[PDB]
Amino acid sequence: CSCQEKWVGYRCNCYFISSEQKTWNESRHLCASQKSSLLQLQNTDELDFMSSSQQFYWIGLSYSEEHTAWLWENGSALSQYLFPSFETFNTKNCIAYNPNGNALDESCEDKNRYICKQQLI
Numbered sequence: 001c002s003c004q005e006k007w008v009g010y011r012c013n014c015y016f017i018s019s020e021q022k023t024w025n026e027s028r029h030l031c032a033s034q035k036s037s038l039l040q041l042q043n044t045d046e047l048d049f050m051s052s053s054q055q056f057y058w059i060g061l062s063y064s065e066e067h068t069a070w071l072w073e074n075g076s077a078l079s080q081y082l083f084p085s086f087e088t089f090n091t092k093n094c095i096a097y098n099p100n101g102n103a104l105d106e107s108c109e110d111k112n113r114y115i116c117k118q119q120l121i
Contacts, residue, residue: 004034007118008049010048011046013118014118015047015116016031016115016117017113017115018114019113021111021112021113022113023111024112025109027113031116036116036118038060038073039116040059040072041082041097047099052099053098053099053100056098057099058095058097058112059115060072060073061078063091063093070089083095088105093105096110
């Protein structure tokens, strides 16, 4: 399950954990730019390794008034028991996440780091 240059492999998946801080719509595009996409958490334990990092990251979850629901990049709804805070998330924000499970919602125009992930050959 080999991956491209500065990409990290785990569970036969390729992840990209950026150093630069960008906008959620940018990163969104940078990942897309690389045939990958703004992280869709298949579960809280997707980043075992990064286990501690006390910093948040941008992820592919964003609200969507058209389906009155939070959605991942491919349009799957957000599981209600995934993130707990859930109900707090101010629909006008993006979702930032922390390897240790914690997750925030900050202006989609802030400047956090991003995480792309190539999932299927």
